[PDB]
Amino acid sequence: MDPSQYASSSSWTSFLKSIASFNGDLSSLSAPPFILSPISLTEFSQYWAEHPELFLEPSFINDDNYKEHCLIDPEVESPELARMLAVTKWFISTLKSQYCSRNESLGSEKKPLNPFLGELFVGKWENKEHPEFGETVLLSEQVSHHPPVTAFSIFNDKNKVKLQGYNQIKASFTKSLMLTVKQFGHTMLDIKDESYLVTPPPLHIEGILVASPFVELEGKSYIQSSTGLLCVIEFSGRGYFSGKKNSFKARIYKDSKDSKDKEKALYTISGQWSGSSKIIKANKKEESRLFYDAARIPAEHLNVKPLEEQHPLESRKAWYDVAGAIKLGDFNLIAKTKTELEETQRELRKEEEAKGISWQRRWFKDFDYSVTPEEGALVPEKDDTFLKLASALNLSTKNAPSGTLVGDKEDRKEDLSSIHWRFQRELWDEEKEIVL
Numbered sequence: 001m002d003p004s005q006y007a008s009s010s011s012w013t014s015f016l017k018s019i020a021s022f023n024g025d026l027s028s029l030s031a032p033p034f035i036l037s038p039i040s041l042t043e044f045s046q047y048w049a050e051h052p053e054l055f056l057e058p059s060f061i062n063d064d065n066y067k068e069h070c071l072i073d074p075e076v077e078s079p080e081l082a083r084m085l086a087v088t089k090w091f092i093s094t095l096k097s098q099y100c101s102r103n104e105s106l107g108s109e110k111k112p113l114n115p116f117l118g119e120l121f122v123g124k125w126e127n128k129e130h131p132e133f134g135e136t137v138l139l140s141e142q143v144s145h146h147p148p149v150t151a152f153s154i155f156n157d158k159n160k161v162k163l164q165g166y167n168q169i170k171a172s173f174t175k176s177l178m179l180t181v182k183q184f185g186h187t188m189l190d191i192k193d194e195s196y197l198v199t200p201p202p203l204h205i206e207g208i209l210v211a212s213p214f215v216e217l218e219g220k221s222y223i224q225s226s227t228g229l230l231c232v233i234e235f236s237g238r239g240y241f242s243g244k245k246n247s248f249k250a251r252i253y254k255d256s257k258d259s260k261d262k263e264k265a266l267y268t269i270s271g272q273w274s275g276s277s278k279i280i281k282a283n284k285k286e287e288s289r290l291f292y293d294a295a296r297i298p299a300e301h302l303n304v305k306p307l308e309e310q311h312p313l314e315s316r317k318a319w320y321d322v323a324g325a326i327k328l329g330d331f332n333l334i335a336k337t338k339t340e341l342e343e344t345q346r347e348l349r350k351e352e353e354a355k356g357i358s359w360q361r362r363w364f365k366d367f368d369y370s371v372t373p374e375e376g377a378l379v380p381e382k383d384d385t386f387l388k389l390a391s392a393l394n395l396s397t398k399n400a401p402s403g404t405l406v407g408d409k410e411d412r413k414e415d416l417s418s419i420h421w422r423f424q425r426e427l428w429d430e431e432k433e434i435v436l
């Protein structure tokens with residue numbers, strides 16, 4: 001049917017009613033075929049680097065050229081600061097990919113495919129137009145199905161730029177049908193020997209009543225560097241802070257302590273992350289300059305090998321039948337193909353339980369950061385990067401919502417674990433079946 005017919009359709013009305021008895025599992029929702037996406041959530045990891053040049057820019061900045069690598073401030077104070085500005089621009093550039101991609105390609109935000117345990121999604125940005133860039137690899141794996149957890153790593157060996165992280169959410173509906181989403185997990189970005197800890201922000205899905213869902217960000221995201229510098233990004237929508245949706249304000253401070261006082265902000269960036277934003281140095285409001293304009297920079301999608309040569313665990317190959325049915329809009333075929341895949345998984349799990357066998361994650365392992373780790377679990381190293389960056393930011397290391405600070409209510413939650421997924425490069429190095 002035409003989108004103008006969605007809101008009043010029998011299907012949408014039945015869907016809205018299923019929300020009333022929502023059990024916390026988004027998959028229990030009877031989402032009509034027209035609001036279904038043929039893309040699995042394991043693919044979302046690619047959204048962290050769809051702008052190759054921005055992802056790699058920090059690695060080209062050094063003590064001998066940093067002032068030549070800071071468009072908004074040729075008189076930038078230091079290379080560490082020029083790199084924090086570059087990392088900040090990269091982070092901002094990821095937002096349109098992360099949260100607006102489906103509105104563009106599907107017509108609105110839609111229900112993504114719930115990944116199966118073990119699902120993989122791999123590819124690479126060949127960066128053929130920039131030989132100095134080199135190849136950038138994306139590895140994404142579904143390390144958990146109950147609940148859904150996606151772990152990932154994107155790395156550029158040539159320039160020594162590597163990123164890793166994982167993600168999971170907890171959703172619930174308000175009485176007004178707003179879908180509140182809290183993200184969990186964090187992402188770490190290494191630029192040679194310099195490190196950055198990034199925390200995703202919470203968000204809500206608007207437009208559910210009118211059947212035209214879309215994402216709006218809220219709360220805060222942090223970018224804590226090993227250099228001490230810290231960027232605090234605050235998100236707002238419609239009005240409140242800005243008069244336009246998808247707005248934000250980011251401030252860079254010399255350190256976590258200085259972030260308590262907004263006046264100590266070295267720079268202040270503001271505007272829309274899906275559009276244009278300006279930057280002001282110190283309090284020199286009269287000297288604002290264009291920081292980023294998402295409309296001028298086309299996203300670059302990674303290269304994925306053809307279906308014919310994909311491993312059975314690779315997302316697109318495994319979901320092929322379901323994706324085809326969804327694109328066709330065939331109610332029965334969608335149910336049939338989805339059940340076939342999911343029922344096979346269920347049988348697999350039941351067998352593992354009966355045979356006393358466990359699913360082994362391929363490239364990621366869960367590290368127990370708790371003071372009282374499970375006897376068989378892996379424990380973090382001495383100079384763990386996350387530990388020091390989280391300490392500098394005073395970020396909680398527990399499995400609390402992303403961005404939770406030590407002392408916050410979420411951090412004082414009783415019996416809350418502190419297990420985090422970590423990429424094991426060695427495991428990819430000795431990979432025997434998967435290729436790019």
Ligand SMILES: CC(C)CCC[C@@H](C)[C@H]1CC[C@H]2[C@@H]3[C@@H](O)C=C4C[C@@H](O)CC[C@]4(C)[C@H]3CC[C@]12C
Nearest residue numbers: 026035044098099109110111112167181213215
């Ligand atoms: C849309 C509605 C009909 C059903 C509910 C869909 C809901 C579960 C989807 C829709 C938006 C999805 C977000 C997506 O906006 C972007 C990201 C960023 C990525 O890094 C991690 C996943 C996440 C949070 C998606 C989770 C699933 C969401 C909320």
